[PDB]
Amino acid sequence: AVCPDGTRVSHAACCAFIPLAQDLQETIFQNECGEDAHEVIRLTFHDAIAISRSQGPKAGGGADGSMLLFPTVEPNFSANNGIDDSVNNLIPFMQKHNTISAADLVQFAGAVALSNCPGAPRLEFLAGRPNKTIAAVDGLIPEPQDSVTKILQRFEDAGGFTPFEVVSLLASHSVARADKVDQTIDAAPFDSTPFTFDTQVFLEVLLKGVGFPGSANNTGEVASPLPLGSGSDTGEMRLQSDFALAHDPRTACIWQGFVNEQAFMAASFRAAMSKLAVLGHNRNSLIDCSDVVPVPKPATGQPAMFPASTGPQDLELSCPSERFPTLTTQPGASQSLIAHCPDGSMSCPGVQFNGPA
Numbered sequence: 001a002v003c004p005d006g007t008r009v010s011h012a013a014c015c016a017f018i019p020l021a022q023d024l025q026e027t028i029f030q031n032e033c034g035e036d037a038h039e040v041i042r043l044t045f046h047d048a049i050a051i052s053r054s055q056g057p058k059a060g061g062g063a064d065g066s067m068l069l070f071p072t073v074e075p076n077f078s079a080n081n082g083i084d085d086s087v088n089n090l091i092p093f094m095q096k097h098n099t100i101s102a103a104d105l106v107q108f109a110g111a112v113a114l115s116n117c118p119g120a121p122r123l124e125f126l127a128g129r130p131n132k133t134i135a136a137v138d139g140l141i142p143e144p145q146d147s148v149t150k151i152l153q154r155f156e157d158a159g160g161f162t163p164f165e166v167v168s169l170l171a172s173h174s175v176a177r178a179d180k181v182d183q184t185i186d187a188a189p190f191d192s193t194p195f196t197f198d199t200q201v202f203l204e205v206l207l208k209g210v211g212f213p214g215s216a217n218n219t220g221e222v223a224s225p226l227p228l229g230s231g232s233d234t235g236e237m238r239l240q241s242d243f244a245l246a247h248d249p250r251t252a253c254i255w256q257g258f259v260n261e262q263a264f265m266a267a268s269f270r271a272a273m274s275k276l277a278v279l280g281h282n283r284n285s286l287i288d289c290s291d292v293v294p295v296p297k298p299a300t301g302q303p304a305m306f307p308a309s310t311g312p313q314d315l316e317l318s319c320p321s322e323r324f325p326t327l328t329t330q331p332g333a334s335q336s337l338i339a340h341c342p343d344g345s346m347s348c349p350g351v352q353f354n355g356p357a
């Protein structure tokens, strides 16, 4: 088909996603992999994972837009703490771009946001999820204090995910920060490059922790290898769950497998997101609109590196059968601050709408 703007696309049904991408980029992402992109990418996962094979359809409809359609239910569960701002940012798009369902809007917006993160894959995007569902029940969202057994079980119950797929999806923590785990600090990143979809998170979670970016006894948090912060440039935070996954016998070799393996990490993330984005649906019933997902920013191609203040002597390795790669170390005697802002500054407040969530 040829869309009103002149773009030739695979299917006429995909045309409406072109002005939706443009509006999302102009209004909330500004083509950056920043705070508002990060919040939307987390929303794609919390919308989709709230589904349970064992409990039946009444527990939740998966990638069904339930967070937007029932903004006062799930966003208020304690495991969904902080999800409200992303829901309030996307509801105005649901109302304006009103030929696209809330469910499709959530997944597409996640794809567009990810496209702004250098090294991300260009996600598959299928369209056609209905615009009516139910509110999910509580307890379906994994939490950072959860054990690996609990987490792997949640993902298997939700959609048959394998432990490989689960760790693959956690490549999203390469572009992720925390505001609620420690109430005294904002936007504590999970790796030293939270605006770049690289493999640093897999490397850095394997370093010995030496302190905390904020206070020392928050639920779901463990010691960080790069806890130094100053002004708005908050130190790195480490989640108990990511730490546990990196060291458990079921997942340790998969975790290490992504260190310094950018294209493998990106292709694996894409395959698992392909599955996540259609939870609650038969993929044979959705039409393929992958061609209207923006082309991602390319990585620079540089290998992973130990941040200054760290080195191979700091590794806490857990995979007996695979060789840890030989990496260089960024020069410098002490930790560099991790920038609060994509252009390296500290002053970049993201667009935020008020709303019902």
Ligand code: HEM
Binding pocket: 035, 038, 039, 041, 042, 045, 082, 142, 143, 144, 145, 151, 169, 170, 172, 173, 175, 176, 177, 178, 179, 180, 181, 182, 220, 239, 241
């Ligand atoms: C065991 C599974 C996971 C757990 C327990 C987990 C936990 C968390 C926690 C606690 C935060 C911090 C929220 C805050 O306090 O502000 C967070 C942030 C984030 N997570 Fe995860 N997560 C997991 C899986 C995922 C997956 C599968 C994705 C996406 C495909 C995802 C994407 C992100 C993003 C992008 C952020 C950053 C949001 C922001 O910076 O505002 N997470 N995660």
Ligand SMILES: *[C@@H]1O[C@H](CO)[C@@H](O[C@@H]2O[C@H](CO)[C@@H](O)[C@H](O)[C@H]2NC(C)=O)[C@H](O)[C@H]1NC(C)=O
Binding pocket: 069, 094, 095, 096, 098, 099, 100, 101, 102, 131
């Ligand atoms: C999907 O459902 C939502 C919620 O019912 C619809 O949102 C309404 O959209 C109209 C414009 O079409 C607005 O006047 C309303 O304010 C919106 N309602 C709410 C509660 O925000 C949306 O239009 C539906 N989309 C599709 C494709 O059917």
Ligand SMILES: *[C@H]1O[C@H](CO)[C@@H](O)[C@H](O)[C@@H]1O
Binding pocket: 308, 330, 331, 332, 333, 334, 335, 336, 337
């Ligand atoms: C970042 O900053 C640290 C000091 O905070 C340096 O040691 C490093 O070389 C890099 O410039």
Ligand SMILES: [Ca+2]
Binding pocket: 046, 047, 048, 049, 050, 060, 061, 062, 063, 064, 065, 066, 067, 136
């Ligand atoms: Ca949902």
Ligand SMILES: [Ca+2]
Binding pocket: 173, 174, 175, 191, 192, 193, 194, 195, 196, 197, 198, 199, 200, 201
């Ligand atoms: Ca990163």
Ligand SMILES: [Sm+3]
Binding pocket: 035, 038, 039, 082, 177, 178, 179
């Ligand atoms: Sm946030």
